[PDB]
Amino acid sequence: MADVLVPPRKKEILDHYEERADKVEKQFQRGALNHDERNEALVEIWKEATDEVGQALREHYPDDNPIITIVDSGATGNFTQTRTLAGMKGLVTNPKGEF
């Protein structure tokens, strides 16, 4: 677990996207948009957050980190599993299929 490094800049990223999620929820609460559109906006905002957290995680790690060494070797595992081990899990699906 000393070898699974978290990104220092995660909390700032999460606050930056939490402000946008809060604003979208407010514009829904004031009736400016219906129930589905705010869900779509939140989905896109949190996809952007996932991309940014993954990018910061990727640029943070060294090259001799064994987890990223295993991945970039092509031995096994894509980068998303590293993103979920450290950083953010992201959007998780509905039983029906939605986010």
Partner: protein, 1111 residues
Amino acid sequence: NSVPGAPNRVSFAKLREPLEVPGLLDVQTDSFEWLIGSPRWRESAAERGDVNPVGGLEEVLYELSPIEDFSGSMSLSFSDPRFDDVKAPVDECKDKDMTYAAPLFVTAEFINNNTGEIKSQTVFMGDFPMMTEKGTFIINGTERVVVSQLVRSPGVYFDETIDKSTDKTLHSVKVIPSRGAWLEFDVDKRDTVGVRIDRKRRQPVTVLLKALGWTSEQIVERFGFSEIMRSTLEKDNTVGTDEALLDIYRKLRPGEPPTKESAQTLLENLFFKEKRYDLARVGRYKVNKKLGLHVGEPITSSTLTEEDVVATIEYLVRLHEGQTTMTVPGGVEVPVETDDIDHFGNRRLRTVGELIQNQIRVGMSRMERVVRERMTTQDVEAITPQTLINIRPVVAAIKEFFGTSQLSQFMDQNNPLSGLTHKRRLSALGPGGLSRERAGLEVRDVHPSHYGRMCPIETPEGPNIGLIGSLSVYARVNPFGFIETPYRKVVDGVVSDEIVYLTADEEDRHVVAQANSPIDADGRFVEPRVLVRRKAGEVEYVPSSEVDYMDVSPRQMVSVATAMIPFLEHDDANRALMGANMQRQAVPLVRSEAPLVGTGMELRAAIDAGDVVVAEESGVIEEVSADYITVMHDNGTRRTYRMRKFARSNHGTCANQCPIVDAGDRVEAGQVIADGPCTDDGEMALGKNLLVAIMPWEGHNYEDAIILSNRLVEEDVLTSIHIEEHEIDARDTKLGAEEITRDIPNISDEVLADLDERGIVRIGAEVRDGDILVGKVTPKGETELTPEERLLRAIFGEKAREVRDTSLKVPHGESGKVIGIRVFSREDEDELPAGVNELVRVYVAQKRKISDGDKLAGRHGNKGVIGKILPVEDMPFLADGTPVDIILNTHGVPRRMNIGQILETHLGWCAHSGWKVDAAKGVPDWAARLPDELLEAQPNAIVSTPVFDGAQEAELQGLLSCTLPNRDGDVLVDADGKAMLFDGRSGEPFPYPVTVGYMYIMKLHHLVDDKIHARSTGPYSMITQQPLGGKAQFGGQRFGEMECWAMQAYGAAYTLQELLTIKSDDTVGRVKVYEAIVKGENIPEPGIPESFKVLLKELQSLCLNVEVLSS
């Protein structure tokens, strides 16, 4: 904690759970004693639900009470169910294969109307099976458990769909009751409302409404706001109660003369005459709540009320109207919604009590039929309930339930946990439920109502995912059968300690907080924005004023077995699911070491699983021996608890119980007094704490394979005792009697040596594949002897002794000692099945050690076979010279998302070496929130992390950097958690530090000796002449269709011809092949199989001339 002799296991719980874990076997015991009517359930009702007693059996008798003839001259009312004492104690029943039962006595009463009498008796109804103390039925001599089933609750289901041809919401209702009939009020493509009654060609409302006593004027009177109902009134196309009900009888009963009185009576008969319609107590309460018809009215009148019919129609039409709430006259208003067939407000738990009640009813109705038929045939002034009651049907029903049923399964007991988890099991695939093919894929998903009522993790990973689950830790089943759940009531922003139980409906009504929330030591929340759950599974940040309920504790969502996984919250759900499904498959080892790192559920899962003797009342031990403990209960009395040393389980594993107390110790009531198979000091212990390193070593730990030291084999660390049972019956035969005798026709004295005199082996003889466990000789009569055989017999001076040999022989690969021999015989009056003069069972047993191919797994889903047991010197050892014991692989960790094992590893090492929080300069922030007496710990000191309030990663880092040295000045594992291993084989140090620690791993019940199999020539099937199937026989492996495709694709024609002609079916070809192999000749050319000749004779048997003409 709160258990007298509790292993002092320090917890990392930051939170403080108020409510204790309940009586983990209450879902079984309370249901059964509800069925009986025990004083325990009587007092429980006195506390909660004191309205009236419903003694299961009692309800059945009352509802049946009385059996009245058609002429209405004679009545019978069996009443007042009563139970005698169990015919035999448990162990005697389990040994002598008796079903552990007790008689039923019932006061029957026969009354003649015309003359006037009562004929009261006490009729023996039948030997009713009884639950043991552990929540199991000993039926037929085995230990069977009845698994609770989940089925759709009777009630009103208002549901709607969309129509892509019209794009309109189409609402509808169904009222599927118990023992009743189906009814549908629908709104069709047009703006009319179909009222299909009993599955046949719809109806407009008005027909029924007038037939229900509601005139068109009254229809407007109540449904005036209902513009849809008003439009349907315009569309009525018919008016008049008499004409409407007459057309009802004419249509619903097609072609039946629609006479008014038969039709009027039929309306009642189907819907209000309760002999053909009974929505039960559960459905009645459900519908009462839905329509809010009644509140304090006792739950009774389990039959439909037309008052409810018109309310259903009004609610439906207002649902189409888009209303929010609805007030019915005479009842408090209710809100207007639809219903789902997953939300646990609509799926109920038909617990063992209710299932046995239903089966007893299926028996009692048959009894009633027979009773009344005979009563009519019998002459009056001569008969009595003794002459009326036939008790065959009830016995037959109960027998066919406990035996031969889907929902009465052998208690899988490999380890105590597998016992306690085969109970508490929810199974949706039962009679009255759904099959694994009619299983809607919407029934297997975790609907957000499962939180706190059914564990989302633990389900079998086979083709049963979601159809079988397990109850939560804190779940409790409502009398009606809805899975209640405890919550904490928060009022005025004040969290209290008054635990209140809620079903799924009130879970939807109200709003639920989280237990890991900042309570400010006064019930007061801290931050206003609080995590909370809304009705539809939504998650929202409510201000901290509208919260009215909070969770009782974390790890409430989770089952029993999954709550025993440390660091669960880090593992992915797939591998946690696997970990939970393999934590029930460990085998009882001979040493049974407690886990170094665990949760709080290792003690409460043993003292409640029944596989640990418990001191009933306080006392002082006097005689502690390997078989009996004598406790001197203070006030005079003494009691001898008796062990079950080396008792065979239901899957061949040991069931030893050794004491843990000494002759002078004082015990308190509720204390662990003797460990079971998997236990050590009372804490569930399924495996051993093995030293583990996480390097990939030489490709032996490649792709989930695991290597081991030879220390594990030698010092008997991993070693499971398996006790197998063999059984031979001396059945009678027409030719004579089969005699279990030492002498056997050709058997020489050399092999005979083991058999003592009766024919059985002697306790202790090391049998091996082919030994004569029991020597039985069967009459054969005179048969012709081949000239050659006669010559040899005479030359060597051996006669015939026609009586043929069929002695029992230990199956292939089933060696071991003979623990014990049990002989049942007719002379001893033992009640063997007819035809069996003697049935002898021999219990062989072997001390299986760990072996290449055995399956080992941790608590995190990280299974794997043993690739190689290396010697102790070619094992990476530390700087201290201590060799590692297993070596897992690295590549399996990151891509399976189960780093729990890593944290468990690090903490494990911390718990072994012991830490000492460097608080000389004050407690570091790393331990600022850590409880007291964790600032220092001793080597091999036991620790626990509860599931969802465990060790925060920072805590592990600091602990790992604060371990005390072993014996010299040597901190072997640095702050990172890794150590400098020396290669035991080559010698050079590994150039990079490697993770080491102590991980708790188990030995699964997938041993190689149960799996390896081989056949050259063995038994053959009967109709077709293929080799047989399964390891019980020899059999071969199915060379199925896909393998035939594979070898067609290679172009291997000759091998395909081989495997499909002269290895499976070519009857005359197999013996020629064997003869040619032995004589050393070319394998003969194969012939036509025996599946292209049975076909030919069938086609010449269905009169289709199938012929072969080369030209």
